[PDB]
Symmetry: C2
Subunit: 118 residues, 2 copies
């Protein structure tokens, strides 16, 4: 329970996003979207790695920047995925992007809550 | 043995570097050098996170950029720590930095060997 459970669920979301965004990149085959999604996937991979290891750094000043950067990534992801969602005319994929955005929004709120006190 | 043992030793080196560089920050009390060291520490933390999780991504295109970026960080660390070592007049700390640099050099060689075929 508690925060460790919240972080586990964030990690599970990020893992799913990678798989889902890789499917979306295969369906679309557009070069602007490929560059955006490639970089989002890179971020999501790092978020998984860092949050899996986060206990090691709880007493270390580095924790402030680790969480700040993950939150900043997620904020950028919402903006970019919203842009892609608006640009597309492909209702199934637009709905998938909307659901990913909802996850990213929740992650920002939860990580902000944790970052506040660390 | 094999690559997994090489990666385990790289991770153990990075963990040690963080502790050692944090000691060096505390001995030096020097804001300009300390800012450089704080950024190196942030990189080392991410290297540990990413290499601990690396099996997850071996079949994924992201693996190329994950390893490329770690290697690029290590290359920058050598340049910056070499310049810092030359700047200091503090033989014990200069020797500590020399040994960290040696580790970073070995990491680049081993990760380049691993990167080649992935
Ligand atoms: Zn995310
Ligand atoms: Zn290193």
């Amino acid at each position: 329970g508690g925060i460790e459970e919240l972080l586990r669920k964030i990690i599970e979301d990020e893992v799913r996003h990678i798989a889902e965004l890789e499917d979306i990149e295969k369906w679309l085959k557009d070069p602007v979207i490929e560059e955006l999604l490639r970089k989002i996937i890179e971020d999501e991979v790092r978020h998984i790695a860092e949050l899996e290891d986060i206990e090691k750094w709880l007493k270390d000043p580095v924790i402030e920047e680790l969480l700040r950067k993950i939150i900043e990534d997620e904020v950028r992801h919402i903006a970019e995925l919203e842009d892609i969602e608006k640009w597309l005319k492909d209702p199934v994929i637009e709905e998938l992007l909307r659901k990913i955005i909802e996850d990213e929004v929740r992650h920002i709120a939860e990580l902000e809550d944790i970052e506040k006190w660390l």
